[PDB]
């Protein structure tokens, strides 16, 4: 689209303050902020044009924004509540004139938690194709499993022979809850990679499932015995089997 | 709500889709905007208009003579056009976009030769996974009533180099009582489903 | 050449202040103006107030575009300043003047450019503020403005009135006299 | 004198024969010079001063800007005329007519709309001095007609759309 947003993911504790950055498209003067929560859907917050506020939504006093001279924008969310867990989308248009369409950024996925000690990295496992599948279809499906992670801030990718692949790949739209009844439940996510039986049967072929986890940073505190659940890559690999 | 749309719409891939929208309380200064949101993506502009038929590179928009209703026309919706389509009324002078529920559009792939089957997969290192695959669009995967059994929703992969598409749902559990034969029991799976002998 | 001419509307923004003006005109008369500081639409008739509605946000959004447009054209025209014009002042009564019966004195201030003017009333040399009303800067075809100021009074042989007009185009403050 | 840079934008509607003829002219003015404009009869933005080409060319290259302006004949001009038909175009204010010696002047004050016919009649007289139609600025007009001029009574006849029959005022 042309619009960029930083960070892509955020994991914060209740009561904390957080700042979201956005860069409009080159040439765009008007900048916008939206919130996408499960309870209220897509909600308009504020609009800025040439550094000044033009329109306001149902934006709380805790929330505040600004458009700087380089036309980039910042969204500040203070006294964070569990209910503030949403997608924060930035948008930009050439001007404020009503004919101008809006170009949206990729969004910031914010998860607010009571304790940062609830953050856990995933465990990744690769399940080799079924010999019965190979015999019945002459195709081989590899399954990847990312489990026990919090928050659901993960990017799964398949790597074949040191190259990222997209063909024959399909991942679940969202991670599912391992404990649906429980609050701050750890998540699970699966993915399939399907190749020809001949390709899987070549022992020189290398398959790697990579899960990029977005957790704690160098600015986050840690006082527990277990390893700090930082932003990291957890992988599982398998070789072709004859 | 300023606009009313059907909650859901199902369609086949490489086929046109007519997404309807009612907006009886429209004003002479209001435009009809259509936006969409692809899964895990930011909203995207589709088209906007004031009267009659409006066209662009993405779609056509047919607005009624009384302007109290409109239709979004996706001339050849692909699997990549599966998204939530929002019909929005916005004043020709305003920028604020008010998003309602919208229509969740599901695109069904064309499964040329269905071969439904449930396969067992063993871990590379050392739980066990059951894969339900090669079923047609008529088959819907139901969620597990069992807390210790996890079943994903159907997902479609495309082996581009072979011009082949297939559906797949994954089930896994730590329980000893879990087996691939009973894994998808809460789901309405086909009669001709192949169950291999381990 | 038409049966009815309307301006929906007259958008004004100038560097001095900076200051601006938003108004809608129909057949040479001001329907309403938007108070940019109050963010409020002020209709010039009771009929208009009861029947018609205009969102002031559209007026404020328009002035924001004019501010952007002005700063772009200033750089283009190599910073060309506005030429000050000499205004024309005409003083007259609204209805026939009769001693004892209440009337209104109209002060037409035509050919105003730049749109920055001080229109005040002086009764027997001394300043008056009670019962004084004014229109906004009404547009002209030659992209100049005109403002009309009013004074409600009680005509008598003791009171003499003057319309004091201050403008950059004038060396000394202009004074047009009126006598009953 | 202080330095001032003035910018004006005038979005004007021109109505003829009710709703039959509608035309819009948007004007962009720097100080007093209209550098660029949009005429609905032309259909595209036009530069009217060598200060206009960067503005006019940019607005015409943007399809969304061009279509919004084209549609402003409906979203502004045609939309607001319907609001004028119910208010302004139905405003009928009866004039106040009083004859006072100054010569006998016929004072026709506080009327709307502008359409007025004032004639002196005894039979109708020719050789009258009438002042131009004065705009009071408070949505009312005024006009004064003087005549050159025993037992004979002078009548001032006034015709206005607000009156079913003309107001007759005598001066014996």
């Amino acid at each position: 689209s042309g619009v960029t947003q930083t960070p892509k993911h955020l994991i914060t504790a209740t009561g904390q303050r957080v700042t979201l950055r956005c860069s409009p498209r080159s040439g765009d003067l008007s900048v916008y902020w939206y919130q996408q929560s499960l309870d209220q859907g897509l909600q308009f917050l504020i609009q800025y044009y040439n550094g000044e506020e033009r329109a306001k939504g149902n934006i709380l006093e805790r929330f505040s924004a600004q458009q700087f001279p380089d036309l980039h924008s910042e969204l500040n969310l203070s006294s964070l509540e569990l209910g503030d867990s949403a997608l924060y989308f930035c948008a930009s248009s050439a001007g404020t004139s009503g004919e101008y369409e809006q170009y949206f950024g990729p969004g910031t996925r914010l998860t607010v938690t009571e304790d940062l000690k609830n953050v856990f990295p995933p465990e990744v496992a690769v399940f080799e194709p079924s010999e019965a599948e190979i015999s019945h279809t002459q195709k081989a499906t590899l399954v990847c499993l990312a489990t026990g992670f919090y928050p659901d801030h993960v990017e799964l990718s398949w790597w074949v022979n040191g190259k990222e692949v997209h063909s024959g790949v399909c991942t679940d739209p969202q991670p599912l809850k391992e404990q649906p009844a429980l609050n701050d439940s750890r998540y699970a996510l699966s993915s399939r990679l399907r190749v020809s039986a001949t390709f899987w049967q070549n022992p020189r072929n290398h398959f790697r499932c990579q899960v990029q986890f977005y957790g704690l940073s160098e600015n986050d505190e840690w006082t527990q015995d277990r390893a700090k659940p930082v932003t990291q890559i957890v992988s599982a690999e398998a070789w072709g089997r004859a | 709500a300023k606009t009313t749309q059907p909650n859901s719409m199902e369609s086949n891939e490489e086929e046109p889709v007519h997404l309807p929208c009612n907006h009886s309380t429209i004003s002479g200064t209001d435009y009809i905007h259509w936006y969409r949101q692809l899964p895990s993506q930011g909203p995207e502009y589709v088209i906007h208009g004031l009267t009659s038929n409006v066209n662009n590179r993405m779609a056509s928009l047919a607005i009624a003579e009384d302007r109290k209703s409109s239709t979004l026309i996706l001339h050849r919706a692909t699997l990549r056009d599966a998204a939530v389509y929002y019909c929005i009324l916005r004043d020709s002078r305003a920028q604020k976009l008010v998003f309602g529920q919208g229509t969740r559009l599901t695109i069904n792939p064309n499964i040329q030769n269905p071969d439904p089957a449930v396969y067992q997969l063993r871990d590379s290192k050392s739980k066990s996974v059951c894969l339900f695959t090669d079923f047609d669009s008529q088959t819907n995967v139901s969620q597990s009533k069992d807390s210790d059994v996890y079943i994903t929703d159907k997902c479609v992969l495309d082996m581009r180099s072979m011009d082949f598409k297939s559906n797949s749902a994954v089930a896994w559990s730590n329980k000893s009582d879990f087996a691939c034969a009973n894994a998808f029991n809460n789901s309405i799976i086909p009669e001709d489903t192949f169950f291999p002998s381990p | 050449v038409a049966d009815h001419v309307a301006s929906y509307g007259v958008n004004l923004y100038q560097s001095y202040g900076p200051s601006g003006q938003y108004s809608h005109e129909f057949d040479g008369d001001e329907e309403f103006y938007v108070d940019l500081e109050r963010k409020e639409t002020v209709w010039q008739l009771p009929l208009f107030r009861r029947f018609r509605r205009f969102d002031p946000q559209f007026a404020l959004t328009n002035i924001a575009v004019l501010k952007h447009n002005l700063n772009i054209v200033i750089k283009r025209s190599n910073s060309t300043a506005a030429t000050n014009e000499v205004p024309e002042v005409t003083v007259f009564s609204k209805s026939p003047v009769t001693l004892g019966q209440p009337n209104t004195l109209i002060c037409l201030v035509d050919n105003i450019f730049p749109p920055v003017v001080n229109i005040t009333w002086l009764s027997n040399g001394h300043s008056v503020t009670e019962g004084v009303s004014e229109t906004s800067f009404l547009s002209k075809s030659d992209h100049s403005f005109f403002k009309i100021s009013y004074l409600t009074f009680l005509p008598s042989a003791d009171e003499i009135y003057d319309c004091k007009v201050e403008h950059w185009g004038l060396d000394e403050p202009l004074l047009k006299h009126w006598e009953p | 004198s202080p330095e001032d840079f003035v910018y004006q934008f005038k979005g004007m509607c021109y109505f003829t024969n009710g709703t039959e003829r509608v035309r819009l002219v948007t004007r962009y003015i720097y100080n007093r010079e209209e550098y660029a404009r949009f005429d609905s009869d032309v259909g595209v933005y036009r530069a009217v001063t060598p200060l206009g080409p960067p503005a006019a060319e940019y607005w015409n290259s943007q399809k969304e800007v061009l279509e919004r302006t084209r549609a402003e004949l409906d979203t502004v001009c045609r939309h607001n005329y319907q609001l004028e038909l119910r208010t302004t175009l139905q405003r009928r204010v009866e004039p106040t007519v009083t004859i006072s010696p100054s010569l006998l002047v016929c004072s026709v004050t506080d009327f709307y709309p502008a359409q007025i016919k004032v004639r002196w009649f005894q039979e109708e007289t020719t050789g009258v001095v009438s002042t131009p139609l004065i705009r009071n600025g408070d949505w009312t007009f005024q006009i004064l007609v003087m005549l050159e001029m025993r037992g004979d009574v002078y009548t001032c006849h006034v015709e206005h759309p607000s009156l079913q029959n003309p107001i007759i005022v005598e001066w014996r």
Binding site: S97 | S92, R93 | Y8, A59, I72 | -
Partner: peptide
Amino acid sequence: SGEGSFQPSQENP
């Protein structure tokens, strides 16, 4: 029934 109004077109920055 709200009033309609013309929009000034934005100058190229």
